Paper text:
The T4 replication system centers on a holoenzyme complex that is assembled from the DNA polymerase ([name]) and the [name] ([name]) loaded onto a primer/template junction by the clamp loader complex (gp44/62) in the presence of ATP. The [name] plays a crucial role by encircling the DNA double helix and anchoring the polymerase to the template. Sequence analysis reveals that T4 polymerase contains three main structural regions: an N-terminal domain, a 3′-5′ exonuclease domain responsible for proofreading activity, and a C-terminal polymerase domain.
Three-dimensional classification of these two-polymerase complex particles yielded three distinct 3D EM maps, designated as states 1, 2, and 3, with overall resolutions of 3.57 Å, 3.7 Å, and 3.74 Å, respectively. Notably, particle distribution shows nearly equivalent populations with bound DNA entering the right polymerase (state 1; 54%) compared to those with DNA entering the left polymerase (states 2 and 3 combined; 46%). In both states 1 and 2, the DNA substrate remains displaced from the polymerization active site in either polymerase, with the primer 3′ terminus positioned 16 Å away from the catalytic residue Asp-620 and the finger domain maintaining an open conformation. The primer 3′-terminus remains excluded from both polymerization and exonuclease active sites of the right polymerase.
Numbering used by the authors:
A (entry chain B), B (entry chain D), C (entry chain E): 1 to 228
D (entry chain A): 623 to 898
E (entry chain C): 761 to 829
The structure:
Amino acid sequence: MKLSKDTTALLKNFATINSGIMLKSGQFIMTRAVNGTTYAEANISDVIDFDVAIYDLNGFLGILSLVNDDAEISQSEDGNIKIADARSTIFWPAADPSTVVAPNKPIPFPVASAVTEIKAEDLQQLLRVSRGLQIDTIAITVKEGKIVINGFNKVEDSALTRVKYSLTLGDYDGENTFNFIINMANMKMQPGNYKLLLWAKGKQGAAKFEGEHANYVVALEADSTHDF
Amino acid sequence: MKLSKDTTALLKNFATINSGIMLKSGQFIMTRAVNGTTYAEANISDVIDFDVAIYDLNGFLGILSLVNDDAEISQSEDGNIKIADARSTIFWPAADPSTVVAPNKPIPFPVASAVTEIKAEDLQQLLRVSRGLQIDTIAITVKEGKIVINGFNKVEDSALTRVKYSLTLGDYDGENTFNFIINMANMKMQPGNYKLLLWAKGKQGAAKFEGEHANYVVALEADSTHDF
Amino acid sequence: MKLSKDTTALLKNFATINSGIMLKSGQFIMTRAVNGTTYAEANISDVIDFDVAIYDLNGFLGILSLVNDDAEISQSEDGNIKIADARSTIFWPAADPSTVVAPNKPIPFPVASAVTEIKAEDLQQLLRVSRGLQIDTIAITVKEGKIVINGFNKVEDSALTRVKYSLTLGDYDGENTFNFIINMANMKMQPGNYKLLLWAKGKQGAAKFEGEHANYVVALEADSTHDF
Amino acid sequence: YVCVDKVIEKVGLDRFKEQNDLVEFMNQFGKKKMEPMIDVAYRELCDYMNNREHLMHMDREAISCPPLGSKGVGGFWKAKKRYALNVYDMEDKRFAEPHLKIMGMETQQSSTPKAVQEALEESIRRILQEGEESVQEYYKNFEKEYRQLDYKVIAEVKTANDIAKYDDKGWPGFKCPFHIRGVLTYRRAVSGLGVAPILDGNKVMVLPLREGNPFGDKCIAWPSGTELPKEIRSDVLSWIDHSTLFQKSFVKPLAGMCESAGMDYEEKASLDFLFG
Amino acid sequence: YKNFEKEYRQLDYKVIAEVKTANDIAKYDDKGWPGFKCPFHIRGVLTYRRAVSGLGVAPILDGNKVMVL
DNA sequence: GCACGAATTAAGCAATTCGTAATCATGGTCAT
DNA sequence: ATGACCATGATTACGAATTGC
């Protein structure tokens, strides 16, 4: 393996999403949450030649940080992971693929029922203020023709009616009024410019955040009221 | 109102004196400790539109610093505080006026018995040694003819027997001899030059640290002994 | 007495070795663990003018770091440590030599069964990878005419079979077959090109560690095997 | 006990000449004014239920009053049946000197040393008869003097049972008791030194230690009455000097009384006089 | 679950009130306030008793249909 | 309770509430 | 510049007390 620094940051994001990941061969990576409420993927620039399942990644990231970026990582002869630097040799245990939660095939995202462009600074400000305003969910919806995000604390309002923090995105050119809802605990994206893609048919629904680096998919909730 | 970064830093320093403060409309910002051991005053270019009883100054300033500098702060419809960025707004609750312990009247610190000057690095060194030497008590005294500083550890030596630390504040001109005893916990100065104005009467008295940004007023412990 | 940054940093390392220390007049400074597994010696850049016993070394390091280097360290009027610059003065008690443990004399370490050179970068890589991988045992041996170091955790691998690190020290010339076990709870050093001189006859031996300014000695575990 | 301070304020304190005048006034006030009222208001009871005859009596069993001119509190309550009074007249017997009368206070409990109880009773005498400066200065005087007594008398005693439940190589266990931690540290201190081992079921005297003691633990325990070995006798005396334990023994009850007495012992100086 | 949550607030508070027996109306509490460890129900018992001081309502008798909210 | 008496059954805990400690996430400030 | 270290809430667990079956 030849993992670049950007690839290391991407797998750090995946580690925040899920402790265990699998490196399928090629230049593509993907993962899902342990409870299966969040999916992620990335079209990395580094080649992968074989599949391997890893239980922990933060320690693996630290070990990769200790050695140079040009170290070669492959399957060890004893059924483990072997890392070879210019001088150092590192052995890492290998986990059974069935012991790691991961998806089967990459998610085909359906047609985006709604499209929005969330900027890096706005999304990052939302994440930082989440802890300050003790918010636990956010509703993306339509207000006076604008697509907006409003943060709601579920603990002190089970009906999600008390505004605490509101942020605007831009004009929405449509009459398909809706009031989505997203669990803040699933917002695990790297700070950057992302594309908000909303899909919702009847009960089923999802949202997708495509950055210049990777892509995330967050699951909507049954409390979301949508109509197109 | 409009709030600038220097004002936010002053507010953050004031937050250590007391958790909550009252921003009465005007130019003079000022607060006191919950136990009354110290009082702080400051004058800032920005004016305050109306009185608000902010409770969690740490949280309020934390969420405030995450938005643009020119964010506008005004009253919400429910009596809370609304801070609007160029593209978003946050609704921070304002508590009842009663629950915040605030100085009802600004203190007109009268003419002091003695005056002196202290440099910026002196306070830094004093605080660092108090953190290191576990210094509990500071004594402003006159030794050899020079006004000097002594450090004590009341926890063990309750009679201030061992002068753990000494510092020569500067020159003394006069015959009055005094030992001003002050606690470390109530020493919440910010780094910089300071002008000490000391006054004693009976069993009590005050010391005022005047600064180029903010000023502090501190009381004396019972062990302080004056001799005019 | 005067001290410099390098002297203070190595004194900090010595504090990591042992809490207390002995200061003989001159240049040559010794310390050893309470159980005596490891010893360390340094020749300071300055000159020591008095003999003193130190109990709380870390506080002394903090004090000497925060104060100006021009401050003079000497014996106080009560035979304690007095650190006084042109501005301040700090008094620290000197503990009774009976309570503290100091080496009797330096160990000359005349003979060296094995000689090897270890680079700073490789040492730091070993340290960090051992902290990450929870390695508390290093086995230094020679295989195929190559001096190598292997990581082992005797808690999980009492049979010394599972190898987690492979640190090839370099090339070996000779038919001596040695394998030395060292426990991580002892050695503590600053990153620098270093020399190692192992020696073990029968059941008694040690490993001397030569640095550009300071030296250490580590008692080899009795389970180490030697065929010289 | 009925508070009669309002009448004393109405007549005036300054018009008197000696404390005996105060007690004499409080004495004859009950007989001339209060006693006939008692008689009539109990005869109304006898009439209310038309009982047989009136037999109840009520006379001034005790008069409590602060010393004349002194700031002294002159008596205070703490809860149900825990008071303190500088009684001056009991059953029509004038006292030439103040007679202290307390109940339910923490001045007689066996767990505290005799010096502690004597100091508590002297603090009571002050807080009742003497002024605030008196109780203030006595607190610091007894703070200075309190460390200048023997270590064994000050230290308390506890019963240690089931040591093996709460030991792991001498370190504290799961909710390890104070005595257990102290005895484990003591056994680690003098292992193989020949003294009699400390086992379960034996009443063991215990005292804490300051932070950073060479024993590595904040406690010490050894058989009660017995004297610990001299080698560890020095440091354990030096490492407990001016300890905080008497906050758990004497300062806490003193606060509990003084707070209900409308006063504080250690002067909490502040800027309040500048604010007004 | 959703239907029950919908109809839980709108109904009368008595039919959801946790009605229990008042056993120790004075054993735990020191003076009105729940002094020592107080059972969930006794705290409410003393709360209502101190709320209706002079309100002209009969105070709690032990064993009554006191409901804790 | 005097003076016994002459026949005899409720067991052992499930559950809550609180306090105190033990461990664990998380932020403020500092040497770097 | 970056985590290190100390201090401060969450969370878990168990002793202790009491009443409920």
